[PDB]
Design a binder for this molecule. Sequence first.
Ligand SMILES: NC(=O)C1=CN([C@@H]2O[C@H](COP(=O)(O)OP(=O)(O)OC[C@H]3O[C@@H](n4cnc5c(N)ncnc54)[C@H](OP(=O)(O)O)[C@@H]3O)[C@@H](O)[C@H]2O)C=CC1
Ligand SMILES: Nc1nc(N)c2c(Cl)c(N)ccc2n1
Length: 192
Amino acid sequence: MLKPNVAIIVAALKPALGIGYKGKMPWRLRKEIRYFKDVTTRTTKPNTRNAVIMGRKTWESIPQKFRPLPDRLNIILSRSYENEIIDDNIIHASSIESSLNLVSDVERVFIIGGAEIYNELINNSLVSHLLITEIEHPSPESIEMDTFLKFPLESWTKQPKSELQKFVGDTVLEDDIKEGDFTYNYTLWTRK
Ligand SMILES: NC(=O)C1=CN([C@@H]2O[C@H](COP(=O)(O)OP(=O)(O)OC[C@H]3O[C@@H](n4cnc5c(N)ncnc54)[C@H](OP(=O)(O)O)[C@@H]3O)[C@@H](O)[C@H]2O)C=CC1
Ligand SMILES: Nc1nc(N)c2c(Cl)c(N)ccc2n1
């Protein structure tokens, strides 16, 4: 696959854009996990699938019994890996672009984390869209976080919900979803 458009998908707590703590997500938002699953799995073309790219630490954080993520091509990046097709669902690679050379019959490509991957790949011009779940809490400072997004948002434009809807197709997008003390909304951003 040559120069595909790539999307980053992440959930962050405003205003600092915290995304983790000691290797885990600092929240368990049931509806959000379901949205992640649907957006990253659904395709429109016929015999295609989407590809999810992640850092080695992220891969290792998924219980072995629950990986690879089903119904998607999984690509794991490590600076120590040789470009290798493990099986039909798993690819090992040392760079995003090399990994993409190994794929065919992929519709969309998503970067799913973690922090290091995100903070590095945001500056790669292959990244054309950001799907950011913006999470709000009454006392954000009470949530322990050690990992944050460092995205140059001044170079990106948040699109209206209509554009997000068009992006996701059929997926139901509820507004101001509440789960415990968290309130969240899905958003789409494109480069200026
Ligand atoms: N809020 C959210 O939506 C999400 C949050 N996260 C959070 O992220 C955190 C984990 O992030 P982090 O620890 O940084 O882990 P990552 O998943 O980003 O893995 C980092 C590893 O990826 C490899 N890697 C990193 N950059 C590159 C590169 N540019 N090219 C090739 N390989 C590269 C390296 O592997 P090697 O060392 O083998 O070279 C590095 O050690 C947790 O807190 C987790 O909860 C994760 C996903 C979503
Ligand atoms: N928005 C969004 N983005 C991710 N990358 C997510 C991941 Cl990897 C897990 N595991 C769960 C929810 C997510 N939610």
